[PDB]
Amino acid sequence: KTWRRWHRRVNTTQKRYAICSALAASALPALVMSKGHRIEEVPELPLVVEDK
Amino acid sequence: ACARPLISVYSEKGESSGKNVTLPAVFKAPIRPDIVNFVHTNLRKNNRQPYA
Amino acid sequence: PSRLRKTRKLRGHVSHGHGRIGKHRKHPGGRGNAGGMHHHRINFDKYHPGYFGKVGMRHYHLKRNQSFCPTVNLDKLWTLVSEQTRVNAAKNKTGAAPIIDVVRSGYYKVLGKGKLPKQPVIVKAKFFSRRAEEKIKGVGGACVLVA
Amino acid sequence: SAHLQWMVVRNCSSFLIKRNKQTYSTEPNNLKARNSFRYNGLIHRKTVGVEPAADGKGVVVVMKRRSGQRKPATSYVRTTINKNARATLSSIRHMIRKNKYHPDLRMAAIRRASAILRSQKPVM
Amino acid sequence: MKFNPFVTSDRSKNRKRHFNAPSHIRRKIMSSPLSKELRQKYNVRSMPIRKDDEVQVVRGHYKGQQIGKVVQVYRKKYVIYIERVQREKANGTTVHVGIHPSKVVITRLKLDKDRKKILERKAKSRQVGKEKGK
Amino acid sequence: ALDSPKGRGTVLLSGPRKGREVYRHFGKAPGTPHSHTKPYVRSKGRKFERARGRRASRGYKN
Amino acid sequence: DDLYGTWRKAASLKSNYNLPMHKMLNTDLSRILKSPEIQRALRAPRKKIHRR
RNA sequence: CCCAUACCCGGCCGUCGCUGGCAGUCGGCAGAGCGAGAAAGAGAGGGACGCUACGCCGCGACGAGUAGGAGGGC
RNA sequence: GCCGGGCGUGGAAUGCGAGUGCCUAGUGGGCCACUUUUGGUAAGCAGAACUGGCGCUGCGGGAUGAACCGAACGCCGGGU
RNA sequence: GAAACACGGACCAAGGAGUCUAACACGUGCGCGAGUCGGGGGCUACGAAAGCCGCCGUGGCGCAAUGAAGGUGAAGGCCGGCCGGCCGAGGUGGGAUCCCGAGGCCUUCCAGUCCGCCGAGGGCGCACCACCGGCCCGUCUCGCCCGCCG
RNA sequence: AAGACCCACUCCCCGGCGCGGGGGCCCAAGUCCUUCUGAUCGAGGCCCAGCCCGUGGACGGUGUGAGGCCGGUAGCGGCCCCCGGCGCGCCGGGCCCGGGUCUUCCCGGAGUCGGGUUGCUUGGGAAUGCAGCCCAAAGCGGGUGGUAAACUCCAUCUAAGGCUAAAUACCGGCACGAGACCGAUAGUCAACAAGUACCGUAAGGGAAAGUUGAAAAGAACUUUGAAGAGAGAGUUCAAGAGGGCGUGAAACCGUUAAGAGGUAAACGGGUGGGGUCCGCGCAGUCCGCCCGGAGGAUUCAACCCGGCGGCGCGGUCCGGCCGUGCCGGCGGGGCGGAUCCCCGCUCUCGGCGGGGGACCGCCCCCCGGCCGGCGACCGGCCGCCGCCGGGCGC
């Protein structure tokens, strides 16, 4: 049927939790390598470039 | 973390600019793969289109 | 997730977890709350006592807004105002009591469940309980009615 | 932290390959290439890697400097050793033992360097 | 990526519109590139192929440096017949092997009043892309 | 663990384990003599299990 | 630092949000176990195998 | 004197139990131990293997099964 | 009924870690035997009591065999 | 009680049967926690997603029960002369853990300290269980008193 | 409503004329070198621009797999038609209109309401609604005020005449887009000459059925036969794709090869024999260290220079940096707070709303001082140590 429960709702604080855990893992080079990203020559992992 | 490091900003041509930014606090939040996974597999159902 | 359900493990077992003697038939006991007085009598009397019968008067056109009266106990009476007021009241030497208007916070009646800290108050409420008044006076406050 | 990052990649890693009832890790600095906490080449502050030289003659020893930990472009120091067999092993033995640099991996590094040197010699 | 919400990207819809296109749309789909010597002469990339146009086959078994004019444009089969591109049948008669226009480079055009006005327009709007961007 | 590895100088406390609302439904079933056990009702009111099993006026009570 | 805030400063761009708290500060249990404070409080490691 | 899947000894598999053991891989900043019947301190004034700890290892006991229940499935 | 104090050779044998709470499927046709036993001329009949079986269970024996006798089962070698 | 003189089945391939929705209960995992929750509504290719909005928490459930209802609505003790001060949130038994320590822990001999360890005994006792008191609402019995705008 | 009295502008609406949406046509860049293939869109390369475009790397076509071959895609891209829009101006028109105070007049919907009764309906319970029949109104009246009735106060509307956009619904229709859907016994009954063939007097019932190949290049010709059918030849990468032709399973059947055969066959356990292939077995292990004799290098240790790294309890080196640490403040600000003069308003003094300002809290910043870290996070010196390179050493 079409009225199967397709969508799900997650607590807003749990959504915000996951984004904090996602960003915080983007600063660990061992976790980004393990994701397969070829980043062995990036100067610094939390890569920041000027607003230009 | 007790002390947060000082991330360096890079110019558009690769070399390190003089400007530095303090590493934001969010990058020290707890890493929760079970939460990131739970939020992902539930929020990813919300873009589904019904079939019957 | 059907891959975790029990039916995935029951593939290959004939009766599918419902036994061979007493087959899984359609409605062996009746549908819904049937037999509440006849063959499910024991269940209804052992787990839902008072289910059958009439008790009390009928109120035809009931409007819940008339009987609306949210209550608050004295234990958390001080949680309605900010902590800055509660500390400036004890720090104050004049003896001026702060005013705690509960109907502004969202309650009507004040019940005297907890113990109060020893410092005067002025509780503005719509109703009071006898113990709630007696405790407020004992601390040194006053009960101010409003409509 | 080391123990924290292990609890994240011990099962979910792109370098992990599990098949034929065996588990392997193909990450760059994992000597013995097994999915383990000791031999993992990304988790720790001090890591030792031994890979064959680019020219095909000799081995490359890769130590992980301790200063820049989140700077991957400068984290690893690579030195090439193209001496005979006995002195090549004697060098990496000193680089690990007399430096107190991850001493639980000296013999594992000597085994790996000995296998790379043995492959590079002319096959008969 | 495409963002126009009214342009489909469905595989089945694009194949249906391709295999059922009317004749005047078949003409457009059966376009061929021009030779390098013609591409900077008219400043035009490609062009729908007419009945009498010199042609080189670039791909397939008949590729080579030979020039041959088209003899017919079999629009129903999405294919063109080039004069010397033929094969021997069993009973000794030859039959024109069909070549797809995309696998064909035009070496000389069949100019006429209607053809020239197309070339200039494809060149006029081409310059707008270089005068608006630069 | 660093300050007190063996737990010396500590007071191990615990929350009220049977404080959950569930334990009011547990025990001897309602409709049993002296079995003050909260029943499962979809709503509380004068006409939700206040009748026959509860009043002496209506049959009996426990 | 304004979308999630530090731990001592709530977020400025969320209504009432602050980073989640850690369940343990020093996650480096390698540096914890071989710390002197613990080693003094340990019995001797019985590591002699007694087969049948 | 003959032999059962019973009993005894041995091998292997699994389960259960010990809520067992192992972070001590403590190395010229070195000293190689906790099998020991007996409440408690080897206390100061160049060197194999290992430890996917959701791992590895050691002892014991045990194993029928329909209806049914649960777990694990590289 | 309350306080306070003093008494431990743990006061028969043998064995064994116990206690406790949730949720809960299937079942609610049974049958057989020793002994006791009711109706019946009797029945491989009908009905009970006690225990053990069969059902849910293979294996050695009774030539054969749901239930008798022995014995209960992971996969094997030796012994008995 | 089936090898049955019980029934279905010649043979092969493909299809073929505990599903979804709602409600409820308990268990479990996660977030927050006397709170919690935007699900409805707004605001800013994938994206019909995601993000945001508390002067969008209306509202739900929870935080208080009891009575048919009018309704009422959750500790006390002492001192001083019904008033004034003080102490002010039960007890008993069993309780994992912690605490104290009578003592007692080797190199040539005693004296001899600090740390660590052990321990008779003695304590504070979590959760929970059993019991005894207490408090709130209904109802009954027995009474004595108080209060004020009518 | 009219009159009187003050007050206030006198400018809108009809009928004609001129000054963004649908359709069409276009717009970037490799068929570049080698090499696979039947065919390349494959593979490799294109340095210093690691080819070229990119606001275009959606998708489809094209002889496998294409950002650059083609159509397209991107663009607040271009051009050309058509439709109404939006005001401006002209003409012919209708167009004299309001507000306030005062006085004097006026004002409402009936076989309807309501009542009885019957039947249906509702959660509506001494009748919520609707309808029939009977009765049948009133005018300080009438209706409602969720328990029948009388009395009495209040409250509340004004029935029995009418119109009215938006938010809302949409398994048909027209036109589009999409999908964690199905993939030819599935998905619509229908991927196809499907509501077709066919069945029934009729109402109605209602199928099965997709795929040669890149391209028909669809097998000329020879030969046997009356012919169907064959044998050659030929086409194609392939006929082991030959017109119901992709792949081509099982049951079943033919044939060839091997084995066997009076308790129907088949089965379990145990061996044996024979086959089938495989081991590429067919003279059987290497790995360290030591000894021996034959050889060969540019060769060891130790020193020298250079670079890099590790560590330092340097007992406490210097300087940065940070603090999910704290204090100090003739500090600076931003907020937060249920902590306490000015302006505005309704009845110069009281009340109200707004704005300060003061205080408290928090955070940020300027400092100063400590505490710690830099092993979730640093530099320079100094020392020790290791490695590498180059010299010597021979």
Look at residue E132 and give its three-state secondary structure: helix
- Quote the CA–CA distance of C56 and D38 in Å, as a whole number: 76
First CA to last CA distance, chain C? 57
Provide the positions of strand H that have an atom within 7 A of a protein CB: 21-28, 33-35, 42, 46-54, 57-60, 66-74
Inter-residue contact G18 to G5 (CB < 8 Å): yes
Look at residue C101 and give its three-state secondary structure: strand
Query: What are the structure tokens assigned to E107, written together?
Result: 């070496």
- Quote the CA–CA distance of G51 and C12 in Å, as a whole number: 44
Tell me whether strands C71-73 and C109-111 are parallel, antiparallel or unpaired. parallel
Minimal CA–CA distance to D36: which of D51, D50, D25?
A: D25
Residue nearest to nucleotide K175 (CA to C1'): E6
Residue nearest to nucleotide K361 (CA to C1'): C84
Minimal CA–CA distance to B17: which of A52, D73, G1?
A: A52
Inter-residue contact D5 to A30 (CB < 8 Å): yes
Helix (H) or strand (E) holding G39: helix G36-39
Provide the positions of strand I that have an atom within 7 A of a protein CB: 21-23, 25-29
- Quote the CA–CA distance of E103 and E55 in Å, as a whole number: 10
Inter-residue contact E44 to E29 (CB < 8 Å): no
Inter-residue contact D117 to D59 (CB < 8 Å): yes
Count of CB atoms within 10 A of residue C96's CB?
11
Contacts 24+ apart (CB under 8 A), D111-115: D111/D32, D112/D31, D112/D32, D112/D50, D113/D50, D113/D59, D113/D61, D113/D88, D113/D89, D114/D85, D114/D89
Q: Which residue from F47, F49, F58 is facing C48, i.e. has the nearest CB?
A: F49
Q: How far is the CA of B46 from the C1' of I13 (A)?
A: 74
Query: What are the structure tokens assigned to D67, written together?
Result: 């200063």
Question: Between the CA of residue D66 and those of A30, E65, G20, G32, what are the distances in Å?
Answer: 15, 65, 30, 20
* Nucleotide lying nearest to C62, CA to C1' measure: K146
Minimal CA–CA distance to D31: which of D105, D100, D123?
A: D105
Interface test with F, best of C47, C62, C67 (most F CBs within 10 A): C47
User: Residue C42's Cα: distance from chain center in Å?
Assistant: 30
Maximum CA extent, chain D: 48
Minimal CA–CA distance to D15: which of C102, G42, A32, E134?
A: A32
Inter-residue contact C123 to C144 (CB < 8 Å): yes
- Quote the CA–CA distance of A46 and B23 in Å, as a whole number: 8
Inter-residue contact E21 to E14 (CB < 8 Å): no
Query: What are the structure tokens assigned to E61, written together?
Result: 């078994």
Q: How far is the CA of C43 from the C1' of H67 (A)?
A: 25
- Quote the CA–CA distance of E118 and E120 in Å, as a whole number: 6
Inter-residue contact C53 to F52 (CB < 8 Å): yes
- Quote the CA–CA distance of G15 and A38 in Å, as a whole number: 38
- Quote the CA–CA distance of G52 and G47 in Å, as a whole number: 16
Count of CB atoms within 10 A of residue C131's CB?
13
Look at residue F21 and give its three-state secondary structure: helix
* Nucleotide lying nearest to F29, CA to C1' measure: I22
Q: What are phi and psi of C38, to 5 degrees?
A: -115, -60
- Quote the CA–CA distance of A9 and B38 in Å, as a whole number: 11
- Quote the CA–CA distance of E109 and E54 in Å, as a whole number: 7
b/e map F22-50, b = 16+ CB within 10 Å: eeeeeeebbbeeeeeeebeeeeeeeeebb
Could you tell me where the beta strands, DSSP code E, fall in E1-134? 31-33, 46-48, 54-57, 68-74, 79-88, 94-99, 104-108
Asked how this structure was determined, the answer is: cryo-EM
Query: What are the structure tokens assigned to B21, written together?
Result: 């930014």
Question: Between the CA of residue C5 and those of A8, C1, C38, F12, what are the distances in Å?
Answer: 20, 7, 36, 40
Query: What amino acid occupies position G40?
Result: R
- Quote the CA–CA distance of E46 and E33 in Å, as a whole number: 4
Query: What are the structure tokens assigned to E53, written together?
Result: 């146009």
- Chain G residues in contact with F3 by the CB 8 A cut-off are 37
Interface test with C, best of F38, F46, F62 (most C CBs within 10 A): F46
Q: What is the CA radius of gyration of chain G?
A: 22
- Chain C residues in contact with F32 by the CB 8 A cut-off are 46
Resolution in A: 2.8
The length of chain E, given as a count of residues: 134
First CA to last CA distance, chain E? 24
